[PDB]
Amino acid sequence: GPVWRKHYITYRINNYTPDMNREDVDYAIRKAFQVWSNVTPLKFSKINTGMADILVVFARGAHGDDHAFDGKGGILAHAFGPGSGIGGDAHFDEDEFWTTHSGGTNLFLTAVHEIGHSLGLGHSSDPKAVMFPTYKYVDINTFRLSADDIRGIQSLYG
């Protein structure tokens, strides 16, 4: 599968979920990028204008790619592996209730998983990995990538 062949990667938040404070959206996505650059050579920067490598989108139902969201529950978000255009982009189902904590769906945790996909990771069979397909709330202040997450991103980069 695809990997980014460049070290400086950019993202853009396209729009903001009304479920949270704006600064909290900025912080959650910031923090999620840092999870991955802590273990690879990549550097991530937020730009506010023009074409980003990774476009962060809150949308609901059918939203202009071929992967319709399905209302509350089920599919929480999805992301496209490295490549041009929509390659790299990470979309969050606005029909979920995005939060900074354990109520609704923790944006930070979901973003870590989705940027994993933006960077070219698939899913892990290990329930303990963040790349396990099913969403588990863990304390975000003491969150750490599992061994398997680290082996996986490391074999793509670095």
Known binding residues for Ca(2+): 19, 53, 70-71, 73, 75, 85, 87, 89, 93-94, 96
Q: Which is nearer to Ca ion, 27 or 87 (CB)?
A: 87
Give which of Ca ion, Zn ion, none residue 88 binds (C-beta under 5 to 8 Å, depending on kind).
Ca ion
Closest of 42, 19, 8, 156 to residue 101, by C-alpha: 19
Between CA 93 and CA 45 the distance in angstroms is 23
CA 150 to chain centre: 16
Q: Does 149 bind Ca ion (CB under 5 A)?
A: no
Give bridge partners of residue 53 from the DSSP assignment: none
Q: Does 120 bind Ca ion (CB under 5 A)?
A: no
Between CA 116 and CA 138 the distance in angstroms is 17
Show Cβ contacts of residue 142 under 8 Å, excluding neighbours closer than 6 positions. none
How many residues belong to the site for Zn ion (CB under 5 A)?
3
Among 12, 54, 91, 108, binds Zn ion (CB under 5 A): 91
* Interface ranges with Zn ion (CB under 5 A): 65, 67, 91
Positions marked active-site: 114
